[PDB]
Curated annotation (Swiss-Prot), chain B:
Chaperone necessary for the incorporation of Rieske iron-sulfur protein UQCRFS1 into the mitochondrial respiratory chain complex III. Plays an important role in the maintenance of mitochondrial tubular networks, respiratory chain assembly and formation of the LETM1 complex. This is Mitochondrial chaperone BCS1. Belongs to the AAA ATPase family. BCS1 subfamily. The chain holds residues 62 to 122 of 418 of the full protein. Disruption phenotype: Mice show phenotypes similar to the human GRACILE syndrome caused by defects in respiratory in mitochondrial respiratory chain complex III assembly. After three weeks of age, mice develop growth failure, hepatic glycogen depletion, steatosis, fibrosis, and cirrhosis, as well as tubulopathy, lactacidosis and short lifespan. The lineage of its organism: Eukaryota, Metazoa, Chordata, Craniata, Vertebrata.
Length: 371, 61, 223, 33
């Protein structure tokens, strides 16, 4: 009797305490990694830890092993903005049958404070950590017949600073394409096809295909490479492939000058019966074969020419290929380079620095060989 | 449906569990949003009528 | 119970120490990794292109040591330094817009060790090899462009008897293709350098020309 | 009554030791070998 009365009151007190306490429990919801990684970084002084081993055995004979430490089964005490917090990771008698036949795991966070503004920060910090850890890669798609499949591993993103055009030429195109993605309601509400056209034209090796490769990586979009010289490509093969393209992707066309006919290209570019959120880019090494009426608004919303290297491009490219050099060396170079050549494309500037890689001052004394 | 309504109706809750959405679309694009639901245990909510005892409990099955 | 593999008890190992310093366990795990890895010995896996696809070719060969191929002094170390510089510097290329690829050309009399050395170099760097002879009958211009576009990571591409080169005009996009994978190292072997075009061996296509001659006085003492 | 009183003091001492005691546990992560 006495024991029963005491026990009932105690339980009620705990419930009242629970109201002025705080509990969080995630169970194998792929939150464990994010939460646990933050815990070890935050504590810096921990005793009971468990070992998880990474066996990244790439198929080359290469074995990569790294150790990721997380707290072990039990409880820990940490110091935070609020009062001391009791963190516990505990095992149970129940079992998981999904993945690996392992014990069900529950992680409990209990705090003294009564404000819940704290955990919102904690969860977000873990998201920051997980996305900082991982690095984004541009996923490339290749048309295998009538469908798209991933091609090799996700390539590393070429930064946008590598393709060096005139000042204000890259920023004006960035403003137009960022406006298109962030305004999906302005189109559908007004019945306009949610599509945007872009054209870059100029001599070969100017950076038409170079810039478009790096732009999608910055915007976290994929690319659909398409050369207009394929043998197994026909008219009906291309209309389908452009309709089942992944979302957040850019369509690229190479050397449009060889157009496939011109009259049949109208419904292909601007088709009313087509998907939404489609961005098209056009590159032609010879503008002297396209009709001027092909590049009007509706099909191309911004006309821009990509020419040879200017002084702004040479000063910056010289600092990329030869960093840590004096600014005057990136003025004597650009001065005498333009004085010995009337027109020079970046593809020739990118190849000239391959003869003196990491060897400054050699480029200024050997400009005459470019004749 | 029930859990979403519980969090929306209370707006002021203590014991909560975290469910993470990992909508990793095949483009390198990772989309993460957090859906909050009550944690393991019991809760009390206020409605037009008197206080209601809500309990969510786990089992050995 | 585990239901994944074999129906066995789930196993946990606990290490408990009295001391308050955690420097101890850091050593324990590291020693254990060393023991298991010393026992096993790495093998170079060879791959051969069967038409438009790749298939394993025989068993993993035993790694021929790099000291077995005995060339002049400083010739093996200069090639190791050049290829180790390429693998250990992936950021220097992409940041400057250069395709992350490296070209190599070996020329000399027949039977000097051009193809022998490449077999041992991949084993030293713990890389695989993709065997490809330039004498196949079912090989065309487009067939070679596809095979060269999906290279395994940490691998070296081998070419046999490039002097007998399939057309030459279709070889341009094959050697230096803008639409190709990253971390790709290509090797070229020709028993007669007097048949290649001088413009074919520039940087971008060939980043190192090297001659393999007869035995010197240093090679006889070592052999 | 008697059993409850004895257990509380003993258990707490172990928790104090946990801070002064290091623990490492791997579970079938292919580190066993
Ligand atoms: N404006 C530029 N800035 C930096 N590099 C460039 C530029 N234009 C071209 N390149 C280099 O030239 C190479 C190929 O250019 P490419 O895209 O084929 O020219 P286009 O597509 O205009 O014919 C790439 O390796 C790229 O790094
Ligand atoms: N420099 C060398 N050192 C040791 N052995 C060599 C060397 N060069 C060739 N050999 C031997 O010659 C044989 C075949 O050589 P091979 O690779 O066909 O020459 P290449 O490829 O230059 O025509 C092998 O059995 C190899 O052991
Ligand atoms: Mg082009
Ligand atoms: Mg040979």
């Amino acid at each position: 009797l006495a024991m029963a009365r005491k026990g009932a009151q105690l339980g009620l007190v705990a419930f009242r305490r629970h109201y002025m306490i705080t509990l969080e429990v995630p169970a194998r919801d792929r939150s464990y990694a994010w939460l646990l990684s933050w815990l070890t970084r935050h504590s810096t002084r921990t005793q009971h830890l468990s070992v998880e081993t990474s066996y990244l055995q790439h198929e080359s004979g290469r074995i990569s092993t790294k150790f990721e430490f997380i707290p072990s089964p039990g409880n820990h005490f940490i110091w935070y903005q609020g009062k001391w917090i009791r963190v516990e990771r505990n095992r149970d008698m129940q079992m998981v049958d999904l993945q690996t036949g392992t014990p069900w795991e529950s992680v409990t966070f209990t705090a003294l404070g009564t404000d819940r503004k704290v955990f919102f920060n904690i969860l977000e910090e873990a998201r920051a950590l997980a996305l900082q850890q991982e690095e984004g890669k541009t996923v490339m798609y290749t048309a295998v017949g009538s469908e798209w499949r991933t091609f090799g591993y996700p390539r590393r993103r070429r930064p946008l600073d590598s393709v060096v055009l005139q000042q204000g030429l890259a920023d004006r195109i960035v403003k137009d394409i960022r406006e298109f993605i962030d305004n999906p309601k302005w189109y559908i509400d007004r019945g306009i096809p949610y599509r945007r056209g872009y054209l870059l034209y100029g001599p070969p090796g100017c950076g038409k295909s170079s810039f478009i490769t790096a732009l999608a990586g910055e915007l976290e979009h994929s690319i659909c490479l398409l050369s207009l010289t394929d043998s197994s490509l026909s008219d009906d093969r291309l209309n389908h492939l452009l309709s089942v393209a992944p979302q957040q992707s850019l369509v690229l066309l190479e050397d449009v000058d060889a157009a496939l006919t011109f009259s049949g290209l109208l419904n292909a570019l601007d088709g009313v019966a087509s998907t939404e959120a489609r961005i098209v880019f056009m590159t032609t090494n010879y503008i002297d074969r396209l009709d001027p009426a092909l590049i009007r608004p509706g099909r191309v919303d911004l006309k821009e020419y990509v020419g040879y290297c200017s002084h702004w491009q040479l000063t910056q490219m010289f600092q990329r290929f030869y960093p840590g050099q004096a600014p005057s060396l990136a003025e004597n170079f650009a001065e005498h380079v333009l004085k010995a050549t009337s027109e020079i494309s970046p593809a020739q500037v990118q190849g000239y620095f391959m003869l003196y890689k990491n060897d400054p001052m050699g480029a200024v004394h050997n400009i005459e060989s470019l004749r």
